[PDB]
Symmetry: D3
Subunit: 245 residues, 6 copies
């Protein structure tokens, strides 16, 4: 009957799903929609059916971190999701360019997790569906919201120690735009499961300058509003695209 | 100023913390206590002050999976936690011996995560603290609750695919007792940060037999009760041992 | 001072470059163009300035294999190249769907090389530029040439042995579309060097069926013609997009 | 047939076994016992039956290094040993706290070998039996011998070069107490073969300070005596527990 | 009928083969032989039958880089080659000792490729055949050409970046003599296929000093002539030693 | 003062050293010599000064296994050894060809240890000195003792479990000849410390057929004698060169 961790049935899963880390953000999103229906809330996983621009799609929280989000993503992908967009927060790895409150839309990720490696060899790319990427970009443009594009570092380590150096500076040099914790895992599971994925992120600080105070847990309100509008617009567009085809 | 994810202050961190994966379990635990004070609930991290046998210790949810729980464990360990017990659920890797509803107290874990390896070389052991392990066993004995002891596989993969073999059969052959998702990460962070750690776990099925229906999300009620009484008793003892 | 292997000057590098494995193919491609100027031919590296649709871009061969093509790509990327499209041949990993003579436009690749790992950690993705991918797709559509899209396995091993199993079946299960030898190396070097990359590939057989005679390195004529038309259209278009 | 390297029979293997690296230490241990029976001495592997406090248990040398000790431990574990305590020497990784002559009882180890990795994936822990650990600690207490506790780094490299940096400072930062060469291997083999293991070690120097002469393989004699008494007492105690239960 | 990349038949393969990176070099070697017969040229793989001192052996180019040369080497080893000598160019990893133009004959190599690892575990050595090494050395002394001997680093990376350190300095400290791109791949494939291998290399610069001019794409002409004389003489001796 | 583990002084170390695993073999060897002087016996490390064919060289035991032998080898290489030959026992990886009692002379090895990896990256070859190899082979030929040549797998695992597959069958398919536990470690330390190394090994069984009784660690006496004569002759011949 009910999925094991989402506690919703196969029949409640829609072709398009918006995922977010923070079950709090699901509440912020659902009020922006035309209407919504709360489906379930188990553990970190809160599921709401959204109605927006004539379309029906779930918004589901995935929790912090790749192993816990993989549980969510597998239950979605194995039970009928066709398109999953992650809308999340991130740190800037290009502090001269990308600042707090800026928005980045990402087409690929660094697999600095474990779960993707337990599913497929490390040489395999974490890459999004490029039409989902294009839809996110197009929606930002339609909405007159400037955005960055680039690779996300998805790292399982949020707090580094002083023993093993963090790879973040290496990846900055390699031109990764941003760092968060879940996108690579989504992308790999999606590819493996024939599910189209993408990622849009809001910057909350720069991990190179956390000792300087370059962090705020409270996201820039109008920029957060803009990201949700872009993410919802893209989900509705991909839902109408899916429904036609 | 509050911890970034826990959203409690450093002053609110007690020497002993009981951690669980499911925020819903915090409510089940806190009502077993003599009294409790709700502190915060942010993301999947719910924090309550428990009072039990005259002692005071936090109960905090850490969510599913090693990277998410590491955020919780670092915030506790960097801000004054001295002892942390994980009370969680697990699958049996020894189905002939360890059955649904049984309880395992674990002394060490397999580091099938990523974050511990981002903190220290993979050769380093995920090992719990002796006194914690011993207190858990002694409490089970006093409560007359049979338990197993053994190594946990802490794996970031809950749902395997058909491409890369799961290592679970290998580790069963190596005499690992159970599997869950967080314990190795706790142990390694605790060793690195000089925090004493331990784990007690309730069996909810067997991953080798999920296709036969050997799984139930609803934990055997009396055994969950016993596990909680053991964990709370050990937390209270360790809180007085710490004073001492 | 000439580039060490290409034997052309920095001054001769154009923003857009079309790369191919076979120096013989550079000569097939140039005659399709409006006009051309031969620049150099050293080792496997043949360089020709192409004129097409009022645009100017190099076509340069890179030889067989990741280490040799990296020398080519580094010399291009460090001396003024801004967009590099690889037009190559490949095997199908999905023989029921993708057949000899079909064309695949690839957005990402498996890094089964060494040189990319000597440049950046394994976890980093081999991923192409969206604009380049989109332009290649749009030109195929404008020419009414059907194409597949997907991930290529870029493997340094063409001939497997009987000791260490090939990962090709694993990657087929993982939904990789095709296999060749250079594309992951191109994509990683491009990302590190801020150069936009992409790949278009023609199927010459299926490695799973070589023992059945499912192979022919005489590429299907009208299909090779189609792929060259799309690649040249995309280069010309991207040359003007760069100018803007 | 005799065991290939120990050259004793399966029938001579006792439930409890004390192992040491140095065959010479088997000579210092045995004369401490009530009585002993010299069994065999083949290659670096010297085996004696010890009789101490009413109990009977082998003492066996395992040689220097993880691959050589694995041969010994496999022959013991595959032929009836149920408890193996290693009593060894080690270097300090915490020179401000742990000094030459001090004794450390360890309950897990860093797997800086190869043979354990040829037997099980690297993520698997090298961990001791915590009853064995507790018995060693309790014996140290009864004898009024202060001890340290913590993780040993078990490294196959004794003499580092200037090319690949040693991981020893890393592991010092990670709170590993001491370094030696065999304990991880014993622990992993014991876990795989259902044999309870533990480790007690005497400090002979600090590897960070070898260039300053912080080393002497002449072990502090009164502390070596103490370590032997703790190890023998723990073996005898575990032997009785074994016999009562079995 | 024809090998996929070399486009020669099995019947055209001689027991001894000289391999070189550059197809241009096959043309330069062949004209130096007593006579020759061009066989094939496809992609970067050019195949010519050489006749020298009464013996015959192919000279075949393998291209730049391990994956490209493995295609060539597999085709030779699986179709009847019995002895393969690589003659090539290299950088010095010992610049106080081994200079531009110097000649190094190598008995083993560092496996800094991927293809050898896709064939056999990384712990397996890249090692050449003794007789081949000894024959090379003996021809060198015969012709009174000083040579060095040691290990080559065969690295898939010619141009390092500033993110992941090159291991070349480590391998210099480890006493590797020189660096090039193909020899370890030849050695491993040879061992796996029961084919006897070896390497002779001429130094064209030092990768530690490229940023100060220690490089020249013109190989010292007379030292190069000497290297090739050594290589051809050895191929002839081995074609008889094999015989 | 004394070497930590060998318990001899640097002054006692000769240019050429013969190493064996078993201290009992040192006692066996020394009595074949013209004369000897017992120097030290500490732990597994027994040191004797041998006098054979007018030459002087140590014979020292290194114990079982790579980590223990590395301690012996570093002490030798860091205090004056120039040439080290290992004379050991091994299992056959090619049981149709190489049988109990056969002798193999080896010139490279699989690095299935840890200590070599803690000293240099895994891609680096474990390779013997080719002059030492040649000296061993020539000594065998002139004593009319047939020998095999090839790669040894040096594996830290003697007793495999049923969880992780042994790589031995893979290495047999890769044409490795025999398996033992120390040679790769010797070769790597020697290359790093500029010491010339080599290995001669007598087969005591086949690990693929241990469950059929294909083992006896009583080495074939006449064959052990032959190996010792070969190793001793090579040590002397190499010792005349030091100067
Ligand atoms: O800076 C960060 N690092 C990792 N994850 C994040 N999510 C928001 N900011 C960050
Ligand atoms: O079977 C399991 N596997 C991983 N985590 C778990 N938590 C409860 N059961 C399990
Ligand atoms: O099948 C193939 N495998 C690898 N490279 C290729 N290039 C064309 N076809 C192939
Ligand atoms: O300092 C040491 N290092 C490694 N092993 C040891 N055994 C005793 N001391 C040491
Ligand atoms: O310096 C070099 N590095 C790599 N390959 C080479 N081939 C000639 N010189 C070199
Ligand atoms: O069969 C063997 N395996 C490993 N080491 C050995 N030493 C002698 N025989 C063997
Ligand atoms: O605060 C950490 C969280 O924000 C972004 C990141 O991906 C993680 O879930
Ligand atoms: O259902 C999975 C959860 O239960 C136990 C495991 O550790 C994880 O948090
Ligand atoms: O035949 C192998 C060649 O064709 C395509 C492949 O990428 C390589 O260059
Ligand atoms: O000298 C080093 C030896 O002593 C302790 C170490 O474990 C090794 O056996
Ligand atoms: O310059 C690069 C080429 O020369 C030697 C090297 O092996 C490569 O093939
Ligand atoms: O019996 C094992 C011993 O013999 C040869 C091997 O290398 C080891 O020292
Ligand atoms: Na989580
Ligand atoms: Na050419
Ligand atoms: Na090439
Ligand atoms: Na891109
Ligand atoms: Na030993």
């Amino acid at each position: 009957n009910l999925l094991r961790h989402l506690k919703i049935s196969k029949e409640q899963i829609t072709p398009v799903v918006l995922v977010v880390g923070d079950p709090g953000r699901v509440d912020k999103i659902k009020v922006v929609c035309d209407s919504y229906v709360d489906l379930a809330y188990n553990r970190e996983y809160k599921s709401v059916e959204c109605h927006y621009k004539g379309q029906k799609f779930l918004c589901v929280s995935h929790g912090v971190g790749s192993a816990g989000c993989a549980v969510c993503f597998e239950e979605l992908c194995q039970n009928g999701a066709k398109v999953i967009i992650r809308a999340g927060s991130c740190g800037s790895l290009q502090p001269d360019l990308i600042k707090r409150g800026d928005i980045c839309i990402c087409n690929a990720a660094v697999r600095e997790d474990r779960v993707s490696h337990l599913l497929i060899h490390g040489d395999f790319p974490a890459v999004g569906d490029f039409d989902v990427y294009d839809t996110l970009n197009k929606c930002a443009q339609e909405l007159n919201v400037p955005v960055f594009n680039g690779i996300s570092v998805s790292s399982d380590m949020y707090y580094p120690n002083k023993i093993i150096p963090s790879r973040l500076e290496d990846y900055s040099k390699a031109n990764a735009a941003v760092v968060e914790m879940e996108l690579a895992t989504l992308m790999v599971i999606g590819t493996l499961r024939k599910v189209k994925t993408g990622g849009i992120l809001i910057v909350d600080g720069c991990p190179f300058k956390w000792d300087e105070g370059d962090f705020d847990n409270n996201l820039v309100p109008h920029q957060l509003e803009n990201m949700i509008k872009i993410a919802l617009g893209a989900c509705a567009k991909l839902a109408t695209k899916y429904a036609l085809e």
